[PDB]
């Protein structure tokens, strides 16, 4: 049992996300850590943490049982604090669970930068990509260039052979990078007779450098047609409860990076009828707070329902919330 969240009208892009975030215990602990961290010898006091305390207040209530039977919470307080930051919704496509995830993370970085005299920890969704290039003709490679992410936003590939789509396919499609042409190579010492070794073709190599504690994967199901009309991807992408991320590592080593599914945000319907909804694990009890559960839930604003894993895995995922786990035992 978890408490529901009220939604009169346009607030279910936040309810669905809040049910997903509250299913990531590492994100909750980071908030308890982030909202209580400070430095002793500093002379400036820390800037106030309206968002991270409001977000922690909600997510901690969404990771316990409902405090009175069948209670329904009200997260409108969080809408008000996000408007104290730089954010207002202008159009309908900003009522997006993925857009809000970036509005929240971006605003938590504001709270982090706003207390710069005190060490505040970095949030567990943060990770890095590594750009790299290798010369086809001489195997020489470039220094790495870094890029940062809070979610792996994956474009959904077009069908070649009619095999089912997998999260492996969408992830590889995102990291897979092309051959490049007309590029000078210094190990080849090329251009022309101005050096004396064998314009070349490179291969771009994009892989994962820092893998986050909480991994957010986004399927780009909502896009626009050629001529200004909404395009929705309905194709099922097959995902699993346990996810190996070793095939995407930059570093060539044997240590394993493994993730366990915590929640799935789903988008149902189309225009007028469209709705965001969330599958999530049930939170552990105040006894055994440390041992997570294997009973899933389906949460739709004020409505909460028990769900089977077959139901979660057969859904049409929009956001997949994975959390780093060490070994397979469950």
């Amino acid at each position, epitope marked *: 049992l978890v408490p529901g969240l009220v939604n009169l009208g346009n607030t279910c892009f936040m309810n669905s996300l809040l049910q997903g975030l509250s299913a990531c215990p590492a994100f909750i602990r980071w908030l308890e850590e982030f909202t209580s961290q400070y430095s002793r010898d500093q002379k400036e006091p820390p800037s106030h943490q309206y968002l991270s305390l409001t977000l922690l207040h909600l997510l901690k209530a969404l990771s316990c049982q409902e405090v009175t039977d069948d209670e329904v919470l009200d997260a409108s307080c969080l809408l008000d604090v996000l408007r104290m930051y730089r954010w207002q919704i202008s159009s309908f496509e900003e009522q997006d669970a993925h857009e809000l995830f970036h509005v929240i993370t971006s605003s938590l970085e504001d709270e982090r930068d706003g207390s710069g005299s005190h060490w505040k920890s970095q949030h567990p969704f943060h990770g890095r990509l590594t750009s790299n290039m290798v010369c086809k003709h001489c195997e020489h490679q470039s220094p790495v260039r870094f890029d940062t992410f809070d979610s792996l936003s994956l474009s959904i590939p077009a*069908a*070649t*052979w*009619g*095999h*089912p789509l*997998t999260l*492996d*396919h969408c992830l*590889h*499609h995102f990291i*897979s990078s092309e*051959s490049v042409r007309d590029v000078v190579c210094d190990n080849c010492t090329k251009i022309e007779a101005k050096g004396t070794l064998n314009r070349t073709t490179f*291969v771009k190599q994009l892989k994962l450098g820092k893998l986050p504690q909480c991994l957010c994967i986004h399927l780009q199901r909502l896009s626009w047609s050629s001529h200004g009309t909404p395009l929705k991807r309905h194709e*099922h992408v*097959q995902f699993n409860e346990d996810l190996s991320m070793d*095939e995407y590592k930059y570093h060539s080593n044997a240590s394993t990076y493994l993730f366990r599914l915590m929640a799935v945000v789903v988008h149902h319907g189309d225009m007028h009828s469209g709705h965001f909804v969330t599958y999530r694990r049930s939170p552990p009890s105040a006894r055994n707070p440390l041992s997570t559960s294997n009973q899933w839930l389906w949460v739709s604003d004020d409505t909460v329902r028990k769900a089977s894993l077959q139901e979660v895995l057969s859904s049409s995922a929009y956001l997949l919330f994975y959390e780093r786990v060490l070994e397979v035992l469950f």
Partner: antibody
Amino acid sequence: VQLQQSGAELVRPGASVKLSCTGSGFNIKDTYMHWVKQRPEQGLEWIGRIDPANGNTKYDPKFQGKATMTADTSSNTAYLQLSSLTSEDTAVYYCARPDGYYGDYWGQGTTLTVSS
Amino acid sequence: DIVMTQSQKFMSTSVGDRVSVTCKASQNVGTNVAWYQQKPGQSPKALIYSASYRYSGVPDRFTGSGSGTDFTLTISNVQSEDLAEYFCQQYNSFPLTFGAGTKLELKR
């Protein structure tokens, strides 16, 4: 549930041929369909891909000006047309319809032979 | 185009052996390889998709493995049903090229 195919036949080189494939427990309009060539030395070769719901056809560019892919819904049948044949076109030709739970459906083969 | 290269056109096996058929790709094809089985006088049968996922009715004996450019299909606790031709197929890029095919053979 089968993906049934037309029988074999012989023609002289330089002629032109048509092959057929038909469903039996499904409508071919539901999903993409492929044709592939098979012969023992050069192996399996994909020739093209058709979306029977419309006229969209994607080809291997070695076949693009010589093979031709068509279909009809009411007869539940797709056609492969082959032009200006040579001995190198002597092969077995399969249709294929993909499935997500079962393996993809293949039909019984259609052999094609050309010689004087 | 994608060139799919399997190592050996024939491979020997004991009756209860562990066989691994191998394939090398021209470049990174992601996870997008499928493994087919073909007995003589019959049409192909799809076994694995997305490099490692199985279809319905495919025994636990068949393990798909590999990523990007090198791939292997493994048959462990081999059975007398498994003597056949075995192909790989890439569906990352058009054209949807196949491998050369490995006949796996029974040794005495």
